[PDB]
Write an enzyme that holds these catalytic residues in place. Sequence first.
Site, mmCIF file in Angstrom:
data_model
loop_
_atom_site.group_PDB
_atom_site.id
_atom_site.type_symbol
_atom_site.label_atom_id
_atom_site.label_comp_id
_atom_site.label_asym_id
_atom_site.label_seq_id
_atom_site.Cartn_x
_atom_site.Cartn_y
_atom_site.Cartn_z
ATOM 1 N N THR A 45 0.830 -1.206 0.000
ATOM 2 C CA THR A 45 0.000 0.000 0.000
ATOM 3 C C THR A 45 0.864 1.256 0.000
ATOM 4 O O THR A 45 0.622 2.199 -0.770
ATOM 5 C CB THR A 45 -0.910 0.003 1.218
ATOM 6 O OG1 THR A 45 -1.364 -1.334 1.458
ATOM 7 C CG2 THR A 45 -2.092 0.947 0.995
ATOM 8 N N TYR A 109 -12.625 -3.993 -1.916
ATOM 9 C CA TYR A 109 -13.757 -3.583 -2.742
ATOM 10 C C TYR A 109 -14.797 -4.692 -2.903
ATOM 11 O O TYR A 109 -15.991 -4.443 -2.684
ATOM 12 C CB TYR A 109 -13.292 -3.082 -4.120
ATOM 13 C CG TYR A 109 -14.417 -2.504 -4.957
ATOM 14 C CD1 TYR A 109 -15.280 -1.530 -4.436
ATOM 15 C CD2 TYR A 109 -14.621 -2.923 -6.262
ATOM 16 C CE1 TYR A 109 -16.311 -1.012 -5.199
ATOM 17 C CE2 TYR A 109 -15.643 -2.402 -7.036
ATOM 18 C CZ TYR A 109 -16.491 -1.455 -6.498
ATOM 19 O OH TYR A 109 -17.507 -0.935 -7.280
ATOM 20 N N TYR A 135 -2.376 -10.160 5.230
ATOM 21 C CA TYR A 135 -2.359 -8.722 5.484
ATOM 22 C C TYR A 135 -3.800 -8.256 5.662
ATOM 23 O O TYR A 135 -4.594 -8.280 4.720
ATOM 24 C CB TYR A 135 -1.649 -8.008 4.344
ATOM 25 C CG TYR A 135 -1.595 -6.501 4.390
ATOM 26 C CD1 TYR A 135 -1.847 -5.789 5.558
ATOM 27 C CD2 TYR A 135 -1.253 -5.788 3.239
ATOM 28 C CE1 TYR A 135 -1.792 -4.385 5.562
ATOM 29 C CE2 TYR A 135 -1.202 -4.417 3.231
ATOM 30 C CZ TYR A 135 -1.473 -3.721 4.385
ATOM 31 O OH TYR A 135 -1.397 -2.356 4.344
ATOM 32 N N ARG A 140 -9.071 -0.096 4.710
ATOM 33 C CA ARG A 140 -8.813 0.097 3.287
ATOM 34 C C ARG A 140 -9.523 -0.915 2.403
ATOM 35 O O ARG A 140 -9.869 -0.580 1.268
ATOM 36 C CB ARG A 140 -7.311 0.055 3.000
ATOM 37 C CG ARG A 140 -6.649 1.395 3.232
ATOM 38 C CD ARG A 140 -5.137 1.306 3.155
ATOM 39 N NE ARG A 140 -4.580 2.610 3.514
ATOM 40 C CZ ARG A 140 -4.362 3.603 2.656
ATOM 41 N NH1 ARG A 140 -4.624 3.436 1.374
ATOM 42 N NH2 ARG A 140 -3.885 4.766 3.090
ATOM 43 N N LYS A 164 0.111 -9.539 8.865
ATOM 44 C CA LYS A 164 0.427 -8.167 9.153
ATOM 45 C C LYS A 164 -0.861 -7.437 9.553
ATOM 46 O O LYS A 164 -1.916 -7.504 8.715
ATOM 47 C CB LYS A 164 1.095 -7.431 7.981
ATOM 48 C CG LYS A 164 1.048 -5.922 8.100
ATOM 49 C CD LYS A 164 1.371 -5.341 6.742
ATOM 50 C CE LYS A 164 1.664 -3.834 6.740
ATOM 51 N NZ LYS A 164 1.483 -3.181 5.463
ATOM 52 N N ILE A 205 6.057 -4.014 9.802
ATOM 53 C CA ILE A 205 6.152 -3.551 8.424
ATOM 54 C C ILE A 205 5.753 -2.087 8.485
ATOM 55 O O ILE A 205 4.576 -1.764 8.689
ATOM 56 C CB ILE A 205 5.279 -4.377 7.464
ATOM 57 C CG1 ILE A 205 5.889 -5.786 7.348
ATOM 58 C CG2 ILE A 205 5.224 -3.719 6.051
ATOM 59 C CD1 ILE A 205 5.042 -6.807 6.584
HETATM 60 MG MG MG Z 1 -1.636 2.118 5.181
#
Ligand code: MG
Lengths: 296, 296
Positions: A45, A109, A135, A140, A164, A205
């Site tokens: 990202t 999405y 992840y 998001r 993550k 990360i």
């Molecule tokens: Mg971010």
Amino acid sequence: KNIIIGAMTALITPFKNGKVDEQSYARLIKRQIENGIDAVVPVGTTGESATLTHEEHRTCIEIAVETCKGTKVKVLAGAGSNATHDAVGLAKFAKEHGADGILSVAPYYNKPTQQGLYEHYKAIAQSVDIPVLLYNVPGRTGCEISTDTIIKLFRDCENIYGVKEASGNIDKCVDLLAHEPRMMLISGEDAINYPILSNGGKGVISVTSNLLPDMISALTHFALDENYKEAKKINDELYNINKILFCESNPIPIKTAMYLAGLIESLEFRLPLCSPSKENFAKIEEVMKKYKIKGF
Amino acid sequence: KNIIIGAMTALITPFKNGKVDEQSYARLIKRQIENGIDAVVPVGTTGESATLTHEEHRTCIEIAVETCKGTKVKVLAGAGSNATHDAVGLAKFAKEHGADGILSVAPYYNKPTQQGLYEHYKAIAQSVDIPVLLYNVPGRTGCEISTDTIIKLFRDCENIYGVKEASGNIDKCVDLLAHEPRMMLISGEDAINYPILSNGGKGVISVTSNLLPDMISALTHFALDENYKEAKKINDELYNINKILFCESNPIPIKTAMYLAGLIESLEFRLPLCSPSKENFAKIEEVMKKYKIKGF
Ligand SMILES: [Mg+2]
Ligand SMILES: N[C@@H](CCCC[NH3+])C(=O)O
Ligand SMILES: N[C@@H](CCCC[NH3+])C(=O)O
Ligand SMILES: [Mg+2]
Ligand SMILES: [Mg+2]
């Protein structure tokens, strides 16, 4: 299981005249290597994976792999996609081109169900023989990998070795490590790196490490050695910059800071990302003054 | 402004042996035309836009355009992308291949700022000369087009004529039409079609109309003719099916219902989407029995 843990950087992707600045990319990776980082994550990202072509995405993985040869630094290649066919393709590319493992974001999405997430990650994990880090970033993706789904994938797929976590949910990190203490929990939220490490997380990360790789590496290594007093003191120190780097959506602030530090040449994004507001530009500049930023 | 309004269907994409079933797709659209629908939206969220190749995405727009030719049913092509370069490319393709307008979802996953959304949509609107409908669905994208941004785009760009609102926030719909009553507010949330229309909305882009095109067209046409009593009666009638179609993430329930109705040949999705649980399968089948489903 083979694992990729320690202090890791979600690398920014610099642009020059609308193209990926490949020499700048290699130079930034060497700065990370020289400041104690354990692994780099190309094209996550923070690396604007959404606006890179498939060609550019692959080129950035290769530059990272090439730059880390002859070092102890690993390449955990960003390989996520909201289409399982494309995520499997990126995983196979990363494996065939020398990545040490892959990061694979939960599909965004299209909001797959837990059963769909299981099949998505099982198809990715079965396609390669390198480590796979899940992840979870529900702010998001619109999706969440539940703790049960994470644990089932860890137990059922040999190469899936951890997650993550970028959800700001410390209860979930207690849940994960209490029911499955063998998985590698990786912090994906800089402000709470230390709380996650102190509960048995095994790495970060980091966005902030693009700017302050030495401080993030030190925090992580203090924490992994259970030197908690020193790890917390750095996490506390870094709180202000950890928050300001999300005043606008990542990676707009970090790229702004890298530009203000003279680490990248141009403040260039690919639309729909764009430079921050004048106000946030000034806020990022002011917070940076409280920190010592390594050069090249 | 040139506009596309009324009852519109977010078309499902049927698959056969892992490929787009193109004759079934054309048959489903014709069934829509004949049940009073005003426009069709190929390859939106309901059309599994995330898992179609660029070729498949383009093929479905073309099929829609052929099938609606010689009818007054319009084609509002799904052309969104979280990369402005790709959204411009799809908008131009849709214009060059005869779509009447485009639907363009707000960028998902990369969370652009309001300034970025403005520049994103201004690049799309300037690339074509056909109407552009904004599409706000923050539960899937992680970002929201604010009321101020929507109105600025409406006022600044000629082709931007309204927004498909899937945020479940009727306050925002009062906000929009109180400050900019000229815009076309389109409902993207079936359960509240009638409240959005009764406040001055001018159409729906419906998941439910895949299964019940006649009832959704009637609801919309009653409301546009100011027969609110009858529009509300259908909205109330449709609530149970409108909710059950989101028991799992759309379009898993609607495709399941289309398969149970004998309208598509296979209950096939592209990973990471997958079949519903068998509990949800049974719930969808049970709710459908209370509705009369038109055949071909
Ligand atoms: Mg971010
Ligand atoms: N913009 C699309 C395609 C990106 C493919 C290369 N990273 C997405 O975010 O999935
Ligand atoms: N899966 C990618 C590519 C889709 C391209 C075709 N619509 C995305 O959702 O952006
Ligand atoms: Mg390229
Ligand atoms: Mg030691």
